[PDB]
């Protein structure tokens, strides 16, 4: 009773949010044990934006060009290294609130929870699916890059996504927690654009069940049909154009069975389309047109 988009309780993951600074520029990062992962573009200035050389810009950065910090309780950056699209940054202490955790790599169609953060501080949790095209339709404003997405998996937090960019479309790209981008995209402000979408069916069926469970099942009791719609199939299958008059003649029966014509019609409307399938109406495996409607009122009161 009730169905709303629900995000996993952010508690465990908040514990891990810190901000990372490369003199002026400020992402947020993930503090786990003694490593702090964060997008590798933090080592930039909105000058290298266009199409940066990371391996170069990183190799000119000291070990303490990095001011990591959590609450305040500042952390000094003992080591650092670029791992795909993240920086590792090992820190001088370990998050005493690292939870049980994992770096799964979600698969298109799988929802996860997102923890929009700004300068290392919570703010918002909402629910997202990784579209089949490899974007996700999030809500991310500036200085949120490094926000993460996670799923809870029994006692263990399974991080699956960290946030890098946004396509002109209005969607968002990003990487798994091992620096690999979800998709074709790369972290440079050079106008890429997203594949074409398509809906995820599995999740629409899953959603459909949800509706059943919550007492919405009309869509099961299926169809009724419009007359001109039928006569299309009627003509296809060499049946005789069903007409207004016919529908009346039938009345009397359509009444006392309870099943009005156009519905019964949807029933014939493809009893021909796709067979009787092994089964039998009135001991018959074909459809039987050799009975008028009076013939049937006649043979039973």
């Amino acid at each position: 009773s009730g169905f709303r988009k629900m995000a996993f309780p952010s508690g465990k993951v908040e514990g891990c949010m810190v901000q990372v600074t490369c003199g002026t520029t400020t992402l947020n990062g993930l503090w786990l044990d003694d490593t702090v992962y964060c997008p590798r573009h933090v080592i930039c200035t909105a000058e290298d934006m266009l199409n940066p050389n990371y391996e170069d810009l990183l190799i000119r950065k000291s070990n303490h060009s990095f001011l990591v910090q959590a609450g305040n309780v500042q952390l000094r950056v003992i080591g650092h290294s670029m791992q795909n699209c993240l920086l590792r940054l090992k820190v001088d202490t370990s998050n005493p609130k690292t939870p049980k955790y994992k770096f799964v790599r979600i698969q298109p169609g799988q929802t996860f929870s997102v923890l929009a953060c700004y300068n290392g501080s919570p703010s918002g949790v909402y629910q997202c699916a990784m579209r089949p095209n490899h974007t996700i339709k999030g809500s991310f404003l500036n200085g949120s890059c490094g926000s993460v997405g996670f799923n809870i998996d029994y006692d263990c937090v399974s991080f699956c996504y960290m946030h890098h960019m946004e396509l002109p479309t209005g969607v968002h790209a990003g990487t798994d927690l091992e620096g690999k981008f979800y998709g074709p995209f790369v972290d440079r402000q050079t106008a890429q654009a997203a594949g074409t979408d398509t809906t995820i069916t599995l999740n629409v069926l899953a959603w459909l069940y949800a509706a059943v469970i919550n007492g919405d099942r009309w869509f099961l009791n299926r169809f009724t049909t419009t007359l001109n719609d039928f006569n299309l199939v009627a003509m296809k299958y060499n049946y005789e154009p069903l007409t207004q008059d016919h529908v009346d003649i039938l009345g009397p029966l359509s009444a006392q069975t309870g099943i009005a014509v156009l519905d019964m019609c949807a029933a014939l409307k493809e009893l021909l389309q796709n067979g009787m399938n092994g089964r039998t109406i009135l001991g018959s495996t074909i459809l039987e047109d050799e009975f008028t409607p009076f013939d049937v009122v006649r043979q039973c009161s």
Binding site: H41, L141, P168, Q192
Partner: peptide
Amino acid sequence: XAVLX
């Protein structure tokens, strides 16, 4: 629009 946030 490609836009690294």
